[PDB]
C-alpha cells in the first residue's frame, strides 16, 4: 500500500561521490592536523569504498610524500582563482588518460589543496574544492570509472577485504 514514486531526474545529485570525497578529505584534514572533531572522515571508515580510498591515499602519500603538498603550497590560490588552479592540476594529472593510480593521485591532490587552503586561512575553499572534485568525477571521469568496473572494482583492488 506504499506506492513507489517514480521521480524525475535530479542532475546535480551525486550522493555516493559526495560521501566518498567528503570522507577522504575529512580523513586527510584530521590526519594532517587541520581539522579536529566530528564530521565526515572522523573515526573509522563506515563503507568499504571509503576505507579503500583512505588506504590507497595513505600508501600513495608515503611513496610521494611531498609531491602534492609542495604543489599545493607553491600554487597561487585565492578564492577567485581556486577553481581554475584546481582544474589546471587535475587536467595535467589526467594527461595520458585515467587509471586507478591517477584517480588516487587526484584524491590525494584534492585533499592537499584543502589542507593548504585551511593553512592559508581560506577554509571556505574546503567545501568548494570537494564539490569541484565531485563534478569532475561525475562528468569528466565517470565513463572511465564505469567502463573499468565502477567503484566496486576499486574497492576490490584497494580495500582490505571482507573479514576486515
Amino acid at each position: 500500500h506504499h506506492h513507489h514514486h517514480h521521480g524525475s531526474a535530479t542532475p546535480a545529485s551525486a550522493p555516493d561521490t559526495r560521501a566518498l570525497v567528503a570522507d577522504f578529505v575529512g580523513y586527510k584534514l584530521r590526519q594532517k592536523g587541520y581539522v579536529c572533531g566530528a564530521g565526515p572522515g572522523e573515526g573509522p571508515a563506515a563503507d568499504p569504498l571509503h576505507q579503500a580510498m583512505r588506504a590507497a591515499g595513505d600508501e600513495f602519500e608515503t611513496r610521494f610524500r611531498r609531491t602534492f603538498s609542495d604543489l599545493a603550497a607553491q600554487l597561487h590560490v585565492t578564492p577567485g582563482s581556486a577553481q581554475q588552479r584546481f582544474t589546471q592540476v587535475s587536467d595535467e594529472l589526467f594527461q595520458g588518460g585515467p587509471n586507478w593510480g591517477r584517480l588516487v593521485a587526484f584524491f590525494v591532490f584534492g585533499a592537499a589543496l584543502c589542507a593548504e587552503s585551511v593553512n592559508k586561512e581560506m577554509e571556505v575553499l574546503v567545501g568548494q574544492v570537494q564539490e569541484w572534485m565531485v563534478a569532475y568525477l561525475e562528468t569528466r571521469l565517470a565513463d572511465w570509472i564505469h567502463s573499468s568496473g565502477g567503484w566496486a572494482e576499486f574497492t576490490a583492488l584497494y580495500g582490505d577485504g571482507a573479514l576486515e
Partner: protein, 161 residues
C-alpha cells in the same frame, strides 16, 4: 609466479637496505628492473633511501639508471631530493639524465635547490644541470632556493647562469 615473486623480494630488499639479500636475489634471477605498484624499481628505492652499496651493485648488474616512476621521478630525482650526495655522484657517473623532468616539470636541480642541498647543487651543475629550467609554475631552481631561504644556493645558481 616465481620470477615476479623474486622481483617483489628484490624491491623490498633494496627498499630497506638489505645488501646481502639484494645480491642473493639477483643470483636467483630477480629482474634488476622489476617495478612496484608505483613504477619504482629497486634502484629508485635504494637511491631514495640512501643505500649506496645497493645502488652500486644494481648499476653494475644492469639497472636502468633513468627508470621513471608513476610521478615521473628518476633515481636521480630521489637521491637529489633526499640529500644523498654519493648516490647522486654514482648515478651521474652511470649516465643519469641530469635534466630529467618529473611531474610538473621538476628537475633534480629544482629539488636540490629547494631542499637546501648545496653540494648536490654543485655536482648537478658540474654535470650540465640546466639553471634556467622552468617547472610548470615558471619557477627556476633559483626561484625555489629563494622561496625556501637558501641564499647560498641562490648565489651559486646566480653566478652559474
Amino acid at each position: 609466479h616465481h620470477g615476479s615473486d623474486l622481483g617483489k623480494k628484490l624491491l623490498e630488499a633494496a627498499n630497506v637496505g638489505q645488501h646481502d639479500e639484494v645480491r642473493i636475489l639477483m643470483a636467483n634471477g630477480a629482474d634488476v628492473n622489476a617495478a612496484d605498484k608505483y613504477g619504482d624499481t629497486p634502484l629508485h628505492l635504494a637511491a631514495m633511501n640512501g643505500h649506496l652499496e645497493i645502488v652500486e651493485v644494481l648499476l653494475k648488474t644492469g639497472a636502468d639508471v633513468n627508470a621513471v616512476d608513476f610521478m615521473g621521478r628518476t633515481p636521480l630525482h630521489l637521491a637529489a631530493d633526499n640529500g644523498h650526495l654519493e648516490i647522486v655522484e654514482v648515478l651521474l657517473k652511470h649516465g643519469a639524465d641530469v635534466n630529467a623532468q618529473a611531474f610538473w616539470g621538476k628537475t633534480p636541480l629544482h629539488l636540490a635547490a629547494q631542499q637546501g642541498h648545496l653540494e648536490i647543487v654543485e655536482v648537478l651543475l658540474k654535470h650540465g644541470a640546466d639553471v634556467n629550467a622552468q617547472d610548470k609554475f615558471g619557477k627556476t631552481p633559483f626561484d625555489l632556493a629563494i622561496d625556501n631561504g637558501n641564499e647560498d644556493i641562490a648565489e651559486v645558481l646566480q653566478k652559474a647562469a
